[PDB]
Amino acid sequence: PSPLRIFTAGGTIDADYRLEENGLVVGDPFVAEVLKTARLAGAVSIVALSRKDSLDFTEADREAIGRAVGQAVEDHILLTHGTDTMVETARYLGGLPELAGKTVVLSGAMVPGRVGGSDAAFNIGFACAAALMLAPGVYIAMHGKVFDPAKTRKNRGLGRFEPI
Amino acid sequence: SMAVSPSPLRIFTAGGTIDADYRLEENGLVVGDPFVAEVLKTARLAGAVSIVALSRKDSLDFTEADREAIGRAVGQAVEDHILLTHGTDTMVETARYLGGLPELAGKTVVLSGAMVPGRVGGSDAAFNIGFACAAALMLAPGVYIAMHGKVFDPAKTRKNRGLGRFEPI
Amino acid sequence: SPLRIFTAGGTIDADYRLEENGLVVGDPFVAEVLKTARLAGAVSIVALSRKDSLDFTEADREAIGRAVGQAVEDHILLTHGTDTMVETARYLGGLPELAGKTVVLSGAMVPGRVGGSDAAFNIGFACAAALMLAPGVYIAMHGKVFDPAKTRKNRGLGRFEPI
Amino acid sequence: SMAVSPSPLRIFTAGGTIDADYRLEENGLVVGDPFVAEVLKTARLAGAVSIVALSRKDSLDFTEADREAIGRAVGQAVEDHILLTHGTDTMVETARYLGGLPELAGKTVVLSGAMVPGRVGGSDAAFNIGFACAAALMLAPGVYIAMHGKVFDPAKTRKNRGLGRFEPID
Ligand SMILES: N[C@@H](CC(=O)O)C(=O)O
Ligand SMILES: N[C@@H](CC(=O)O)C(=O)O
Secondary structure, eight states: OOOEEEEEEEOGGGEEEEGGGTEEEEOSOHHHHHHHTSOOOSOEEEEEEEEEOGGGOOHHHHHHHHHHHHHOOOSEEEEEOOSTTHHHHHHHHHTOGGGTTSEEEEEOOSSOTTBTTOSHHHHHHHHHHHHHHSOSEEEEEETTEEEOGGGEEEETTTTEEEEO | OOOOOOOOEEEEEOOOGGGEEEETTTTEEEEOSOHHHHHHHTSOOSSOOEEEEOOOSOGGGOOHHHHHHHHHHHHHOSOSEEEEEOOSTTHHHHHHHHHTOGGGTTOEEEEEOOSSOTTBTTOSHHHHHHHHHHHHHHSOSEEEEEETTEEEOGGGEEEETTTTEEEEO | OOEEEEEEEOGGGEEEEGGGTEEEEOSOHHHHHHHTSOOOSOEEEEEEEEEOGGGOOHHHHHHHHHHHHTOOOSEEEEEOOSSSHHHHHHHHHTOGGGTTSEEEEEOOSSOTTBTTOSHHHHHHHHHHHHHHSOSEEEEEETTEEEOGGGEEEETTTTEEEEO | OOOOOOOOEEEEEOOOGGGEEEETTTTEEEEOSOHHHHHHHTSOOSSOOEEEEOOOSOGGGOOHHHHHHHHHHHHHOSOSEEEEEOOSTTHHHHHHHHHTOGGGTTOEEEEEOOSSOTTBTTOSHHHHHHHHHHHHHHSOSEEEEEETTEEEOGGGEEEETTTTEEEEOO
16 A cells, blocks of 8 residues: 555544543544554554644644645644534535645544444554545545535534534 | 435344354354344434345355345345345355355445454454445445445455455455 | 342443444443353343433432332342442442341442453452342452452552442 | 551453454464453552463363472462452462472362453453452452353362353352
């Protein structure tokens, strides 16, 4: 496979329990736990960007994410991210000429990887393949399919991303 | 019409380490229920995936006749995107055989599995199932092995039993 | 001897809900642990509450006492939040109608449905305690037995400790 | 002085299904590292439990010699509360053997294990470890099997291989 760069921006996928909080915080990146047992053949590296809930991201934050992705010489990019503003980040990156040669896939999980019954590990496998296999562009890989960010919204009534 | 989600992927299960499960009776692992069905239960899929049983043999005990029946089931599917979960010991044999079937020419057919049973701690299974479902949807028509976060050409691949990996010839 | 298990909620039973963007008190985790415990003996589970123990009032503890008093069983396990486990245990230890019973409170500092949880160990340990201890009221946590009158939850330490 | 938590329990490990783990070399389960150590890492214990490896043979491979070596290790512990994790197939034989040693008269010695490996989904292991730790602390001196959420008298217990359960002899 082509070299894959993974950026971690936080989200439910990375949530972990803290006694002090009496609840979940955004913890260490769950993608690193999945890849530790994936027996990878190829070149993959993981970079920490942010440990935020995506609800708390500003236009400034999205701009910083785009410049960070442009710092990678890799042409295949996975960004793990909260689902609540995944569409906004993806649309923002889709507009950056500097990223036009890259395949950039955003993913995450509706249930924390550290909670029972999580979609995280499946989503990570699916999104790593998507980052390696899709043509240049910006995509959301969730629910075992590929979404066009310009034509996607998160439907909270369904608990899924859906096309517009 | 209101939007209908397609179900473009079909999964077949042929057993293998991925599906092993502990049985008191035997004091060890047997080939059990398909682990791929457990991963997809919590994957919050937009579509559905039809999962069909073909076999629960060890991939070491496959004959001509077993490989031929897998070819018919895959050939008869309406879907053009197919994942076959399978033992790793003879995954190359099965993949090479399916490569020779003109009836599969318009289909993307991916074989995958796991070096560690899904029901054992520290398993590659869930990652490999996500990666392989993506590969089955995104690769051009052909027959592939998706393992170790990469895609292998069956004609140019062997299983290294001692090293626990697929590798190039 | 027959064991009766009451569930009053707590961290042990927390589960994720998409609606909440976080944890809520979910179904009792003790039922998931006992499902695979291959039990030989008579055990039954009753739902009492799904609160964070922080929201428990005197009336809440009173309802819990009457429910335990409805059980003919002499071996009782109560799963519960850790934050007011001492208050509930002290209240039950004052009820003459429960004097013949061994009543053990337990729970977990990490939710059973979160990785790295003490829940399953705590449930095994507490079920043994409920069956093996003399009549009384006890907290079983950290692999030992606490006397409620002489115990506090030290949030700085993250453990129950003697006073 | 400031309060010191005692460590009144010692754990010995003799193998068994509880400790099984998958090995690619073998294309199956072997007796791996002691699973009790994994349970106690996340148990938030007040004390500290010393865990001592005695054996990794399958319980069916135990000799008289092996049982004797286990009795000498248990007898030499200073702790009066002892848990021995073990295979279920010959747990009764090891338990009966220990029950005959005068050296163990003042100790509460509990044998436990699991019908399903701790590293396999749906395992009884973690429950059984919590139960057995409590049993080793709370039971009077003697030798016991703690399985299925109850305490067995080794002299009046058999392993039902078919049902994967310990049962009384009535
Ligand atoms: N509030 C979370 C929701 C999620 O990731 O599913 C986030 O956007 O970070
Ligand atoms: N806040 C929780 C803490 C715990 O159970 O550990 C409760 O009392 O419900």
